[PDB]
């Protein structure tokens, strides 16, 4: 299997809107938010928060966490079919979910909070997690095989006060699952030498900017450190979660990340929520301790606001950015594929690009230039011999009754012709 | 060979004392200690509670603790309690209805994991999930798994019932098998009952349907509750399996918190009166499986209720009102029992310890005042040297104390009548 590996300005990329099923309702004045997508081994997982009003200020109505199957039906375009749906009782308590596949089940670790977003009310939030095990091929009358609620028996956080799932999906390594997560370490306990802040090429950048930008605000009580939550399924009835922090190599505030397996080894993506606006992506060198071999990427970034806009590399105290991930599709040329937002300061213009560390080979707009879009989650796979890529794109302020995310299906061309 | 005072006396032969019990120490304020549990067994004890910051009903769950220890006479010629092991589940809000039972060198406690709240108040929403914590009464050094372990229930053989739950403080052991107090959720549509069995012989304002409709939280309740015993055979303990045993038709009452204990050789069973059978339901178990209790013709002990089914109401009405005030058999030849009751027609007040026969209260003593709000009481009695002793945990509420918590008393049964 090979792909087009030459720079073409032609439209060799033709995005198609995938066929996906969901539970049916007749509700109106609704926005589908906090999305999730996790494709693995011909299966998928999907979650969202339904709001009665605006996508920002609406009242929470229904959270659904669902699993299913991706399929080819001779149309040679992937289709999605939901097989199991779980609807928690309290929409407003469920936060930052992350789904990981193993055996015949999707394990989704979510965060329970009665104060609000646990990242914005860190000090007020009391740590609480939840694990939902859903079967991708349900059966009839099998007690706690289709839907099981797993209870954490102990959470090893180490030096960290609180830990929380913070990302859409994770990997498996044998019978041990690794979720994207974040740790809440007090600022006073944070070990950082400002002599390691890269302000040796920046004028108005202070050496203190890196450290102070490791929390939501400069005078925050905690810093945020992205990492992994380990759930060893072979450890009997003790459902123990263990936190694994990321290393200092290109360190940035704890952001939503996603660990995935491709062509053998694992890969890691960390959203650029601070001053390192260029994409953070790379092969995981070690899963424990976590060390990522970030790519020398110079072409793909993310939108920001005023202090840290797109293509900013010099340290500043900021907390801006969007989670737009990318999926390795060829390790020998490190070609990745994903959706990025082609605007400097606003969340607009989604563009599916098959890019390299210093070159966007071919891209294709997924909407118009002033189309508002935010979080993108892209997972790719091999159907027969052709690489296909499913991309969930968050669209907002469409002026519709049921504003929904747009799920795409983009086949990576093999030839650079036509 | 041990003797007890078998005569009625208006004097104060009974002198209660506040027991010394050690718990892990904090210094936080504005807290309520709820969902208590006490179990005494072979000179050992188990204790559980839920710490709530704020209100005793609508407070934020802070700390669930599960504990075991030793009951010893340290020369003060009074029983004392000393904790040896503790476990603090990580999500306190999910732990519900816990039930401890002792075997060999461990206390096994079957709890309920729920994210909808009290499974009895949100029965249709509850997804059955159970937890089992094996704790060592005498811990050893660096002995992981020996000290604290979780026995994932794996299988639950409910039978004709949809959901099953631990619903009672303590249980017994028969050889290598563990019997926990339990409840059983049956959809009304499958509840077999002959309304002609509803005793409305001397109750003019009572219909016959008033018995079948009082077998649920409400008359239209989707589920009826039937108390029983969840079994656990350790002798084949590899892939643990729980098995429900239902209580017989004799004196059927809505599934209420129950207690099975061994006294003077044979098992005894106590069911709370959460419906119109306001009189105490106590008696020797004739057969554990099937569960058959030979309830007593007790005509002196009842429980506070409300307007419909108040204290000393023997007539079938549709009610779900009552408190858990158990009792412990102290003499079988004269069937004398010992426990705490609340002396108020229609309020949870005036806790009163009493040693009582079927149709007579021999001697009794007030524990607090006459207006002290008090709810649940768990009473377990035992023999220290040659003197019968009784430990009663009383739930005391409404005081405004910085730390509201249960009151644990130790009472010596008079042997000769002063
Ligand atoms: C992301 O980008 C970094 C670089 O920015 C990549 O890592 C670098 O890789 C180059 C080689 O490709 C390394 O360069 C080598 O450095 C040796 C020592 O000089 C370096 O010393 C320190 C580290 O020891 C560096 O920090 C410093 O800046 C110097 O660059 C040289 O001796 C080497 O020379 C040898 O090879 C060259 C090339 O053939 C010959 O001409 C020489 O004669 C000699 O044989 C070489 O120049 C560099 O050290 C690496 N940096 C670090 C920090 O490790 C990452 O690989 C890249 N990541 C991805 C995913 O692409
Ligand atoms: C998970 O637990 C099993 C059983 O103790 C062990 O054999 C395995 O190595 C563990 N895997 C880890 C810690 O990654
Ligand atoms: C975004 O900002 C950079 C600043 O270096 C600038 O070079 C670039 O042209 C800007 N892009 C747009 C679309 O304005
Ligand atoms: C409690 O109930 C009994 C029976 O109804 C009654 O005789 C008694 O007077 C009641 N007590 C009070 C204080 O009303």
From Swiss-Prot, chain A:
List all annotated glycosylation positions: 121, 193, 232, 296, 344
Q: What is its main location?
A: virion
Write out the topological domains of type Virion surface.
Answer: 1-418
For this record, the Gene Ontology CC terms, alphabetical, are: host cell plasma membrane; host cell surface; membrane; viral envelope; virion membrane
Out of the domains of life, which is the source?
Viruses
Record keywords = Glycoprotein, Hemagglutinin, Host cell membrane, Host membrane, Host-virus interaction, Membrane, Signal-anchor, Transmembrane, Transmembrane helix, Viral attachment to host cell, Viral envelope protein, Virion, Virus entry into host cell
Q: Which GO terms describe its biological process?
A: symbiont entry into host cell; virion attachment to host cell
Q: Does the keyword Ribonucleoprotein apply?
A: no
Molecular-function GO terms, alphabetical: exo-alpha-sialidase activity; host cell surface receptor binding
Membrane topology recorded in Swiss-Prot or TrEMBL: Single-pass type II membrane protein
The protein's location, in the record's own words, is: Virion membrane; Host cell membrane
**What family does this belong to?**
Belongs to the paramyxoviruses hemagglutinin-neuraminidase family.
Q: Please explain the role this protein plays, according to its UniProt record.
A: Attaches the virus to sialic acid-containing cell receptors and thereby initiating infection. Binding of glycoprotein G to the receptor induces a conformational change that allows the F protein to trigger virion/cell membranes fusion.
Q: Which protein, by its recorded name, is this?
A: Glycoprotein G
Write the lineage as a comma-separated list: Viruses, Riboviria, Orthornavirae, Negarnaviricota, Haploviricotina
Curated annotation (Swiss-Prot), chain B:
**Membrane-protein topology:** Single-pass type II membrane protein
- List this protein's GO terms for biological process: symbiont entry into host cell; virion attachment to host cell
**Chief localisation class:** virion
UniProt keyword list: Glycoprotein, Hemagglutinin, Host cell membrane, Host membrane, Host-virus interaction, Membrane, Signal-anchor, Transmembrane, Transmembrane helix, Viral attachment to host cell, Viral envelope protein, Virion, Virus entry into host cell
Q: Which sites carry carbohydrate?
A: 122, 194, 233, 297, 345
Subcellular location(s) per record: Virion membrane; Host cell membrane
MF (Gene Ontology): exo-alpha-sialidase activity; host cell surface receptor binding
Q: Name one GO cellular component term.
A: viral envelope
User: Which residues face the membrane's Virion surface side?
Assistant: 1-418
Question: What job does the chain carry out?
Answer: Attaches the virus to sialic acid-containing cell receptors and thereby initiating infection. Binding of glycoprotein G to the receptor induces a conformational change that allows the F protein to trigger virion/cell membranes fusion.
To which protein family does this belong?
Belongs to the paramyxoviruses hemagglutinin-neuraminidase family.
Its protein name is: Glycoprotein G
Q: What is the species of this protein?
A: Hendra virus (isolate Horse/Autralia/Hendra/1994)
**What is the organism lineage in this UniProt record?**
Viruses, Riboviria, Orthornavirae, Negarnaviricota, Haploviricotina
Q: Which gene encodes it?
A: G
């Amino acid at each position: 299997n090979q792909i087009c590996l030459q720079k073409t300005t032609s439209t060799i990329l033709k995005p198609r809107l995938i066929s996906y099923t969901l539970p049916i309702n007749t509700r109106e004045g609704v926005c589908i938010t906090d999305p999730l997508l996790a494709v693995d081994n011909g299966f998928f997982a999907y979650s969202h928060l339904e709001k009665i009003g605006s996508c920002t200020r609406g009242i929470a109505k229904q959270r659904i966490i669902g699993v299913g199957e991706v399929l080819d039906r001779g149309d040679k375009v992937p289709s999605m079919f939901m097989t199991n749906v779980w609807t928690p009782p309290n929409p407003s308590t469920i936060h930052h979910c992350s789904s990981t596949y193993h055996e015949d089940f999707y394990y989704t670790l979510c965060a329970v909070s009665h104060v609000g977003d646990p990242i914005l009310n860190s000090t007020s939030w009391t740590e609480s997690l939840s694990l939902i095990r859903l079967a991708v091929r349900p059966k009839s009358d099998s007690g706690d095989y289709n839907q099981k609620y797993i209870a954490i028996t102990k959470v090893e956080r180490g030096k960290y006060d609180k830990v929380m799932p913070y990302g859409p999906s994770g990997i498996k390594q044998g019978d041990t699952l690794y979720f994207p997560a974040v740790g809440f370490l007090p600022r006073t306990e944070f070990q950082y030498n400002d002599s390691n802040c890269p302000i040796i090429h920046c004028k108005y950048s202070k050496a203190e900017n890196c450290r102070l930008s490791m929390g939501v605000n400069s005078k925050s009580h905690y810093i945020l450190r992205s990492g992994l939550l380990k759930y060893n399924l072979s450890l009997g009835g003790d459902i123990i979660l263990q936190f694994i922090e990321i290393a200092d190599n290109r360190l940035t505030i704890g952001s939503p990340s996603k660990i995935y397996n491709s062509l053998g080894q694992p890969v890691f993506y960390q959203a650029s929520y601070s001053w390192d606006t260029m994409i953070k992506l790379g092969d995981v060198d070690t899963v424990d301790p976590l060390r990522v071999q970030w790519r020398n990427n110079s072409v793909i970034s993310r939108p920001g606001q005023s202090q840290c806009p797109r293509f900013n590399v010099c340290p500043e105290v900021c907390w801006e950015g969007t989670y737009n991930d990318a999926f390795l599709i060829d390790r020998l040329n490190w070609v990745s594929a994903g959706v990025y937002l082609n605007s400097n300061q606003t969340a607009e213009n989604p563009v599916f690009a098959v890019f390299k560390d210093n070159e966007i080979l071919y891209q294709v707009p997924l909407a118009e230039d002033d189309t508002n879009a935010q979080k993108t989650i892209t997972d790719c796979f091999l159907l027969e011999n052709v690489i296909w890529c499913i991309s969930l794109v968050e669209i907002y302020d469409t002026g519709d009754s049921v504003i929904r995310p747009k799920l795409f299906a983009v086949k990576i061309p093999a030839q650079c012709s036509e």
